[PDB]
Every structure is written in C-alpha cells, then in structure tokens.
Design a protein around this ligand. Structure first.
Ligand SMILES: O=c1cc(O)n([C@@H]2O[C@H](COP(=O)(O)O)[C@@H](O)[C@H]2O)c(=O)[nH]1
Ligand SMILES: O=c1cc(O)n([C@@H]2O[C@H](COP(=O)(O)O)[C@@H](O)[C@H]2O)c(=O)[nH]1
Lengths: 218, 218
C-alpha cells in the first residue's frame, strides 16, 4: 500500500456532512482514509461508497474485528462488499479469528491490518503483555500489515523488529494522544491522525502543518 | 433485564427479509434479540428500530466494543441513539475503555455487557489467560452484566464465581458451537442461540425445542 504523505486521516466525525466536508478539505494531502464505527454506525455502510465517489481515496475500515471466526467472516464480507479496501482486525482473540478475516480478504482481493498493541493507557493492562506474541502470530499467519501505538515508540520499535522492514506498519496516537509524528515515522510507514486534523478550526492547515513537520521523512 | 425463556436469539442473518421473518416466527418464545455487525453492516442501524417496531423485543447490540475510550464513547452513543437497550463491550482493551462505555450507558439509561472470555478456540491464546482479571476488573468497575462461553463450563463457572450471583450473565456457544443449553444455564442467566435457530427449517420449532429441553430451569 502506498500512502500519500505517510498520513492516514482517521475520519471519526459522526455527521455525514461534516465528515465529507472535512475530508474534502484535506483531500489534497491524503489518499487514505480510515473510517470507523463512529461514522459508519451514524451514517451507514453507504458512507464508504460515498467517500469513494467523492474522493477516490483508499478506505481502511477500522472495525477492530474481534469476534469468533464465523462472525468475523460475515463482518469482512459485509465490509468489503461496501467497498472497503482494507479492514483492521484485533489479534487478541487469536489466530483463527484473524485467519477468518485473511480468508475473506484473500477471496475478495483486499487487505487485513493486524492491530497488535493499542495506544490508550488501558492497553497496558492486558494487550501490551501479549503484543509481541500477537505480532509473531501475525508473522506466522503471513499478515503483511500491522497497527501499533505512536505513544510508545519503544513498543512501536519492537513491533517493527518483529514484523521486519518489508511489512507495512501504521500507527495511531500521534497528535491528540501525545505521539510525535516524526518519531513515529522512524518505525511506522504511515501515521494515523484524527482529532488533530478533524477538530482543527482549519483541518487543511492542520494536515499541512503535520506534513511540514515530517517533510524530510517523505 | 428479564429475558423471556432465558433465551436470546443471535440474529446474524444478513438479509432484512430473512432476519425479520425468522425473528417474527420465534417472537412468541423470545423477547430479547442480539443483533450484531453481520446484520447491522448489511442492513444499517435502522434495523434496530425496525425490530422494535415489529416485535416486542429488547435489543442487545453485540458490537464487541474494543477501541480506545474516546472512540468507545462515540460507538456507544451511536448505538443507544439507534434504540439498542444494551451493548456488549470487550474487556481486554482494559479498564478505561470499559469505563467509557459505562459512562455513556449510565448517561443514557442503558446497559453494558462485559465480554470476558470468548467461546472460539482462538480465545485460548490470549483472552483466556486474562479472563479472570477482566471479570474482576468488571466487578471493580461496577459492571453488572457479563458474557462468558457456553463451550467451557469450567470457565463459565469461574466467571460466575468472580461476578457473584447478583450479576447477570449471558452465554453464547450453545448449539452450533457445541455448548449445551442445560449445562450452560447452571451458570448463565440466559443463553444466546443463533444458527441452531435461524438456520433451522422451522426456527419456531427449533426455539420451542430448546425451551422444552430447559423447561425445568424456567
Ligand atoms: O491503538 C489504537 C488503535 C486505533 O485504531 N486507534 C484509532 O485511531 C484513531 C485515533 O484518533 P486520534 O488522532 O483523534 O487520536 C481513532 O479512530 C482510534 O479509534 C487508536 O487511537 N489507537
Ligand atoms: O464468545 C463469544 C461471544 C459472542 O458474542 N458470540 C456471538 O454469539 C453468537 C453465537 O451464534 P451461534 O449460536 O450461531 O454460534 C454470534 O453472534 C457470535 O458472534 C460468540 O459466538 N462467542
């Protein structure tokens, strides 16, 4: 996956009008948008088609899929049928649940991202201790795309070590959660940014500024 | 909540006409329906209102919420706005993520169910080792409703022990995944059943049959 400016917009606005407006405002800077449940549950799966029609951006469905295999398969099918290019899947529920997503993605020609360690403080309770193993599991399963936390660069570094330089790694937590874009891009291929852009008075300027701060990494 | 016949239908059909037909056919036996992402992502969040309009059923939104606290809040808000009585939340992302859901539920007068251990084989990799602590964390947070696996009675028993007799416990995995309704109701207040009912030639007969088998526990 070739992410423009190593920057993925986390479009978590919950109003169709606002979401389309803000994404339109930053379209020149990004070609990849992560759409999650806040938007989808508020506006419907048709929002994915709407984004594709208006922007042509790649769409990563951030559904943190975390069900049993049978249900995971149904979720992935519905998601890819709606036009998502990729889906984010939790690794914590284990290998079979991940494989179920990999199977659908393989059949439909889409991508799975494996979420290994999360960026919020609660991640330290259970996820962090399992994260290295989750990443190794992804490697065993042939997962090529991963998600890890901007706010813990030492953990992001470990994740990168595990998956190798050829795997694709994206990382949320830059900006609002305190992660630094430049430091994060030492290890991740692209950063995910939501509030620092979409809550900005001027989202275009916010996007431009982030990109300016990392220009030597582009 | 008072679940009729201790039986919750997992309506994971992905076609609105089929979902409505089957639910309507079993409505005499079940007043609580679990609606997850397979149906919601196929038919939209409007499906929740449609079920409310057609049937006298409580709706549990099985969305396995597993994001950071800020995103969890948005998901719960969108879900309760759509008319869900309750939402199911993963505990593995930790206490802050759960607390975020509890805050919205308290604010909107709805219920949170904490998913502790899952019923699929992959659950043994990471979730199982954390499940006792997740349950205990639920108790510390004041969570009153829990989900645990029908297919591991020993684990379901431990869960019930941790949360106490006053907590409400529902359990999937009966039927298609090999769990036994009767054994499961030794520990769970209600069982969740999907395929054994919705894939039956006569779903009403399938539900009636299950209820008949546990008649003494009602
Ligand atoms: O570990 C993770 C994984 C995520 O997907 N996310 C997601 O990435 C986005 C981060 O948004 P923000 O830049 O406003 O913090 C949100 O959509 C959130 O759900 C995260 O914050 N941490
Ligand atoms: O540990 C769990 C937690 C669940 O929510 N579920 C859900 O419960 C339902 C079980 O359906 P079924 O009876 O067809 O196996 C599905 O909707 C599934 O996503 C589960 O099977 N195991």
């Amino acid at each position: 996956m070739d992410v423009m400016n190593r920057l993925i917009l986390a479009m978590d606005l919950m109003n169709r009008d606002d979401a389309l407006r803000v994404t339109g405002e930053v379209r020149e800077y990004i070609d990849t948008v992560k759409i999650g449940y806040p938007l989808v549950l508020s506006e419907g799966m048709d929002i994915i088609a709407e984004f594709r029609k208006r922007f042509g951006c790649r769409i990563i469905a951030d559904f943190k899929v975390a069900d049993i295999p049978e249900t995971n398969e149904k979720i992935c099918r519905a998601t890819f049928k709606a036009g998502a290019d990729a889906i984010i899947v939790h690794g914590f529920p284990g290998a079979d649940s991940v494989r179920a997503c990999l199977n659908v993605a393989e059949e439909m020609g889409r991508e799975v991202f494996l979420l290994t360690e999360m960026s919020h403080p609660g991640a330290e309770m259970f996820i962090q201790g399992a994260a290295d193993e989750i990443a190794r599991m992804g490697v065993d399963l042939g997962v090529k795309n991963y998600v890890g936390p901007s706010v813990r660069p030492e953990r992001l570094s470990r994740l990168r070590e595990i998956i190798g330089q050829d795997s694709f790694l994206i990382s949320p937590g830059a900006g609002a959660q305190g992660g630094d874009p430049g430091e994060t891009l030492r290890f991740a291929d692209a950063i995910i940014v939501g509030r620092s852009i979409y809550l900005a008075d001027n989202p275009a300027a916010a996007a431009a500024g982030i990109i300016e701060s990392i220009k030597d990494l582009l």
